[PDB]
Structure formats: structure tokens, C-alpha cells
């Protein structure tokens, strides 16, 4: 009893949870969480790197502003007053 296809997109993906065995979806969820953590860690690193770039030009004196736009969203808003 079935003439439906597989999945598309995830939907059916969760339907399989009924087949195979017990362990499955929870492990996948954990993997997804790990991926999210990697994504979050990357972003945190990127922000720190963005600071590393705005460093030097963190003292004072004209000089961007300037490259502060084009400028990874701060850069500016930052140059100003």
C-alpha cells in the first residue's frame, strides 16, 4: 500500500524515522547542532578578525572612515562623529 515517491524536501525525510531502527533522528539532530556550533564559532572568529582589521586604525587621525565603506559593516557605522 503506496504509490507516493520518497521525500521532497525534508518532509518524508522524517517519515523514514518509522523505518530502519530506533536510533536515527536524534543523532542527526546532534550533528545539526554541531554544525550550528561550527557556524557560530566561525562567525565569532570572523567578528574577532574584523576587529583585528579595524585595529591599527583604532588609535586616531584621519584615515577611514575612508576604507570604512566599502567596509565590512564596521568598519562603519563607526567612523564618526
Amino acid at each position: 500500500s503506496t504509490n507516493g515517491t520518497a521525500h521532497g524536501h525534508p518532509h518524508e525525510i522524517i517519515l523514514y524515522y518509522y523505518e530502519l531502527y530506533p536510533t536515527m533522528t536524534v543523532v542527526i539532530v546532534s550533528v545539526a547542532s554541531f554544525v550550528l556550533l561550527s557556524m557560530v564559532g566561525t562567525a565569532v572568529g570572523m567578528c574577532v578578525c574584523a576587529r583585528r582589521r579595524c585595529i591599527t586604525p583604532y588609535e586616531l587621525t584621519p584615515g577611514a572612515t575612508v576604507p570604512f565603506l566599502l567596509s565590512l559593516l564596521c568598519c562603519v557605522r563607526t567612523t564618526k562623529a
Binding site: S1, T2, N3, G4
Partner: protein
């Protein structure tokens, strides 16, 4: 040419197998398991039946004391009762008022029914698997009966058959079994000389012809009623009669995998468990050459009617261009689809009609007619 295939161990299901010997026209063989028998080796421990309490006329010793002697008989019971004064229709049986004794004696033996009504206790070990296979070979149905051990070679019309070994060594029979007429029971029956009163084995006979029997019926002789000639006693009722009503459903009804249980000899028939490998050494007789077989081109497939079910609910019309007249083998190249026809006759620019079985709602399959493949697209309905 040796053709090797594996079919599920299921009776009444025809399976199609494509034999493709290189340089020879394809051959389609239909195989169907007619019966699969699991016959265990039996060793009779004992037989049981209804017991008989043999009680002769009591020895009423008038004016004296009777004496009991130890008799080597099953459940032998003897008791001498003092102070008896029994009466018959015409008065007192004894001359003396006091000092009369009644010797009551009894023993247990097999009832007259034991030849007709009995249960046999068997020790069942390592069953030999046997299979009856129907093969549609050269437009004729051939029957092959062989042991499913993968060693027993059976030759029918020059084709050598090697059946098994069975993927499952499972049996519905335990180490100890009990047989009553056409019914078999898995029972850890008491050993000989260990039978309990009012239970299966209260009476035990090693063979049905055996003169000496074991008996444990809790036979106890009682003091007769005042002025009465009789032998009163207390005894646990027939263990065999009790087992007959307490046995429950036999193996024919309780066994897994849809096992059918038969007797004379005790065997498990059509237990749908595991798969069965089949080896067929097909003679050169039924092996034409590719060059000697028709060549098919310009093949097209149309499915005008399809229903996805256990039987052949699909119909397919295949158009072809054959180089010459002759017989071509028909086979499905997709395992999800099976074709009823094993062989059809081809001739030039003509068409063929085949019957197919599938469980798929959208069945896309390849059909090999002789040495050429054709794609079939089918929308099958429930």
C-alpha cells in the same frame, strides 16, 4: 551449464529464473515449491494411556487371619482388615461373629484401550530437510524431490538438481515431543519411572507390547463398609484422560511460520522460514546458440492495463523485428517485476503479449526477449 539461483522458502509461489548461457538464446525456467518437509529422527522413550486398576474378589477369611505378601506388580497394594462380618443375600458369609478378616488387594496395569487410545513420548533430534519442486522445463512440468542439504543430486530429464542448504536451520519441534494420533505437542514429558499421579505419565510403558509397566497413581485401599463385600479405594484419576483435555492446541495450530504438522511419520510441512538456494545443471540439449537463435531489433513496450498485486495484474504488449522464426526466452531484468511467460514464439515484424506481477505503483522495468532488452513504463493501480 550450471544455473544457480536463490528463492524464498515459500510454498505455492511460482518464481521465474532467467538462464543466460553465453552465446546461447536466453532460457526462462518457472520454479514452484510444492512442499518443504522437516522430518525429525524419533527415539521412542515410552507410551502412555488410560490405566486399569485390577481388583480381584477380596479374600474374606472366615474364622482366621489372612496374610499380605509382597507381589512385584505396578502400584501393588495389600491390606488385611480385622473385625469384619460381611453379609450376602441369604445372610452372613462367615460362621464366626468375631475373628474374620478381609484381604483387599489391587495392582495397576495397562487398560484394554492402550492399543487404540495412547500418546507416545519421543526424543526428537536433528531433522532432515526435504523439498518437492515443480519446474516448467521445455514446456513441460517436471517434479524434483530432493533433500535440501546442498549435496543430494537428483537428475530429471538429464538436468541435475542440487537443492539447499537451507538458510534457516529452524524447526517447530523441541528436543522432547508427544504424539497423539494426528497431533504433535512440544512437551518436556517426565522421564520413565518419574511419572506423577493424575498427570501425564502416571502409567508408563516403554513399548505398546511391554508386559511390565511403571505406575504411580496414589492407589490406597480402604476399610470395607459394615457387612459389605467390596474393595473400596482412593486413587488419582487417569493422567492420560486429564492430559487429553489439558493438552491445549497442537503444533499444527501454535507453530510459527505457518507450519503444517503431519504424523506417520512426524513432520513439519511448509514452514515459511528463510530462503532456498537452487542449483540446476542444464544439459547442452536445451542450450541453443545466439547465432542459431532469432535476433531482435526495433523493440517497443506498451502497458495498456496494470494493477499492483501479488498475482499477474499487469499486461504488456511488446513489438519487435525478428531476423528469423524461433523460440525466445522472456525475462524481467528488474527484480521488482516478474513475468508469467518463460518462452514465446517470434516471427519477423510482429508483437507479443506478456503477463507481469509487481508491487510498485510506478513500475519501470526491462524485458529481455532472447538477447535484446526493451524498456517498459507502467502506471499500476491499487
Amino acid at each position: 551449464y550450471e544455473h544457480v539461483t536463490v528463492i524464498p522458502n515459500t510454498v505455492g509461489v511460482p518464481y521465474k529464473t532467467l538462464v543466460n548461457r553465453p552465446g546461447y538464446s536466453p532460457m526462462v525456467l518457472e520454479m514452484e515449491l510444492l512442499s518443504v518437509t522437516l522430518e525429525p529422527t524419533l527415539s521412542l522413550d515410552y507410551i502412555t494411556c488410560e490405566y486399569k486398576t485390577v481388583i480381584p474378589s477380596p479374600y474374606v477369611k472366615c474364622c482366621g487371619t489372612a496374610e499380605c505378601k509382597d507381589k512385584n506388580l505396578p502400584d501393588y497394594s495389600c491390606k488385611v482388615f480385622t473385625g469384619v462380618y460381611p453379609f450376602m443375600w441369604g445372610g452372613a458369609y462367615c460362621f464366626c461373629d468375631a475373628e474374620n478378616t478381609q484381604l483387599s488387594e489391587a495392582h495397576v496395569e495397562k487398560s484394554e484401550s492402550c492399543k487404540t487410545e495412547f500418546a507416545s513420548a519421543y526424543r526428537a533430534h536433528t531433522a532432515s530437510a526435504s523439498a518437492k519442486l515443480r519446474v516448467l522445463y521445455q514446456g513441460n512440468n517436471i517434479t524434483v524431490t530432493a533433500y535440501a542439504n546442498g549435496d543430494h543430486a537428483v537428475t530429471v530429464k538429464d538436468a541435475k538438481f542440487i537443492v539447499g542448504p537451507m538458510s534457516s536451520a529452524w524447526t517447530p519441534f523441541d528436543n522432547k515431543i508427544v504424539v497423539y494420533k494426528g497431533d504433535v505437542y512440544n512437551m518436556d514429558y517426565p522421564p520413565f519411572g518419574a511419572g506423577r499421579p493424575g498427570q501425564f505419565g502416571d502409567i508408563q510403558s516403554r513399548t505398546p507390547e511391554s508386559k511390565d509397566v511403571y505406575a504411580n497413581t496414589q492407589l490406597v485401599l480402604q476399610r470395607p463398609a459394615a457387612g459389605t463385600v467390596h474393595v473400596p479405594y482412593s486413587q488419582a484419576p487417569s493422567g492420560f484422560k486429564y492430559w487429553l483435555k489439558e493438552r491445549g492446541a497442537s503444533l499444527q495450530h501454535t507453530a510459527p511460520f505457518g507450519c503444517q504438522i503431519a504424523t506417520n511419520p512426524v513432520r513439519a510441512v511448509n514452514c515459511a522460514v528463510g530462503n532456498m538456494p537452487i542449483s540446476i545443471d542444464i544439459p547442452e540439449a536445451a542450450f541453443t546458440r545466439v547465432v542459431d537463435a532469432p535476433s531482435l531489433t526495433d523493440m517497443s513496450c506498451e502497458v495498456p492495463a496494470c494493477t499492483h498485486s501479488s498475482d499477474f495484474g499487469g499486461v504488456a504488449i511488446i513489438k519487435y523485428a525478428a531476423s528469423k522464426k524461433g523460440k525466445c526466452a522472456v525475462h524481467s531484468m528488474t527484480n521488482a517485476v516478474t513475468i508469467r511467460e518463460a518462452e514465446i514464439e517470434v516471427e519477423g515484424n510482429s508483437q507479443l503479449q506478456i503477463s507481469f506481477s509487481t508491487a510498485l505503483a510506478s513500475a519501470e522495468f526491462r524485458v529481455q526477449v532472447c538477447s535484446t532488452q526493451v524498456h517498459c513504463a507502467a502506471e499500476c493501480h491499487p
